[PDB]
From a paper:
Whereas ORF2, ORF3 and ORF4 each encode single proteins, ORF1 codes for a large polyprotein (∼190 kDa) that is processed by the virally-encoded protease at five specific sites to release the six ‘mature’ non-structural proteins (NS1/2–[name])—and an array of functional precursors—that are required for virus replication. The viral [name] present within the C-terminal half of the polyprotein performs all the processing, including its own autocatalytic release from the precursor. Norovirus [name] is a cysteine protease with a chymotrypsin-like fold: two β-barrel domains separated by a cleft that contains a Cys-His-Asp/Glu catalytic triad similar in arrangement to the Ser-His-Asp triad characteristic of serine proteases. To this end we extended an inactive MNV [name] construct (which incorporates a [name] mutation to knock out the active site nucleophile) by adding residues from [name], which is immediately downstream in the polyprotein.
We made three constructs, [name] 1′, [name] 2′ and [name] 4′, which were extended by 1, 2 and 4 residues respectively, generating proteases that contain substrates that correspond to P4–P1′, P4-P2′ and P4-P4′ of the [name]–[name] cleavage junction. MNV [name] 1′ crystallised in space group C2 with four molecules in the asymmetric unit. This structure is notable for the fact that, in contrast to the other three structures reported here and the structures previously reported for Norwalk virus [name], the electron density map was of sufficient quality in all four molecules of the asymmetric unit to permit the incorporation of the loop between the β-strands cII and dII. Superposition of the four copies of [name] 1′ indicates some structural variation in this loop—the Cα positions vary by 1–2 Å—consistent with the notion that it is rather flexible. In three of the molecules in the asymmetric unit the C-terminus is disordered beyond residue 173 (chains A and D) or residue 174 (chain C). Although the full C-termini of chains A, C and D of the [name] 1′ could not be modelled, the electron density map revealed additional features that could be built as short stretches of polypeptide. These correspond to portions of the missing C-termini but, because of discontinuities in the electron density, it is not possible to unambiguously ascribe which monomer they belong to. In contrast to chains A, C and D, the electron density for the B chain in the asymmetric unit was sufficiently clear to permit inclusion of all 183 residues of [name] and the extra first residue of [name] (here labelled Gly 184) in the refined model. The C-terminus of Chain B of [name] 1′ beyond Gly 173 extends to make contacts with chain B from an adjacent asymmetric unit to which it is related by a two-fold symmetry axis.
Author numbering: 1 to 174
Amino acid sequence: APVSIWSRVVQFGTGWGFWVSGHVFITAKHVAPPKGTEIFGRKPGDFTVTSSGDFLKYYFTSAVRPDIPAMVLENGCQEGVVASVLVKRASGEMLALAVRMGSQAAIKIGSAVVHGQTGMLLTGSNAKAQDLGTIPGDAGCPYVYKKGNTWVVIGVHVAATRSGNTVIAATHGE
């Protein structure tokens, strides 16, 4: 009966994004298509767009996906929480990566300080040797966890370190 969580993750621009609800879609700003692109067969004027750092939210005034009930969105989680990154690949593969969430920490470079949260993959020290870490292009995939019985989404993937153990999620509530 209930909608799979994976079905909320869809391809978008040069990465992916997540239906929080029937009206709300989120992604990483740096993978999105240009301002004024028709998306999901919608014109500009059918939606409003808000962004904090590399977090990007579309709100469609008329629901795009009535089938999908609203999920609690949060601005990160308590540190130490084990969340999952729901990574889809263009091959079709779906990889849920366990990640221990670190501290809310904000850096690309100086004078362009974007905000998010780090975590370490629980996939081990040699995640990229195993084809079990992320790649750029997984950007936009969601980070989620289960608080009690309730599911909640906390951010979207932006990047990983060279040796892929540390990952970075963009956050906010909007």
